[PDB]
Design a binder for this molecule. Sequence first.
Ligand SMILES: [Cl-]
Ligand SMILES: [Cl-]
Ligand SMILES: [Cl-]
Ligand SMILES: [Cl-]
Ligand SMILES: [Cl-]
Ligand SMILES: [Cl-]
Ligand SMILES: [Cl-]
Ligand SMILES: [Cl-]
Ligand code: NA
Length: 129
Amino acid sequence: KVFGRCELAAAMKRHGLDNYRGYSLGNWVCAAKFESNFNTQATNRNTDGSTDYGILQINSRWWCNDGRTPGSRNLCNIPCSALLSSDITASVNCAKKIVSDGNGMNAWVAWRNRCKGTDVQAWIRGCRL
Ligand SMILES: [Cl-]
Ligand SMILES: [Cl-]
Ligand SMILES: [Cl-]
Ligand SMILES: [Cl-]
Ligand SMILES: [Cl-]
Ligand SMILES: [Cl-]
Ligand SMILES: [Cl-]
Ligand SMILES: [Cl-]
Ligand code: NA
C-alpha cells in the first residue's frame, strides 16, 4: 500500500507513535517519506546482505527474520514480510523497539541526514489528526 501523507500520519498516531520517545509525529512521517516514499512494500538490499523492509525500512540484521541474513537477530520477533503489510501495526511496534535502543531516531540514517533539525511539522501540516 502507498499511503497518503496525512493518511499515514493518522495511522501512526492511532498506533501511538506520535511523540513516542519524544519524537513528534512529523519526525516519523518524514522518516517514512525518505525511507519508503510511504510504500509499505518497499524493500532494499544492503551491502552486508541484510535487507530493509516496509515504510520505515527496518533491517533484518537485527529486527526481523527473513531466513537469508546470516548471523542476524530477530529482536521484534516477526517475519520481515509482516513489515510489508498494508496494516502498519508490525512496523510501528518494531519501530518503537528500535527507537528505544539507545540512539533514538538516529537508528534511521535517513532521518538523521534528511529530517533531523528540519521543520518536520511541515509533514503533518494541514492534516486532520
Ligand atoms: Cl501500491
Ligand atoms: Cl508527500
Ligand atoms: Cl511534528
Ligand atoms: Cl536469517
Ligand atoms: Cl533474536
Ligand atoms: Cl519468521
Ligand atoms: Cl494501518
Ligand atoms: Cl541518507
Ligand atoms: Na534477522
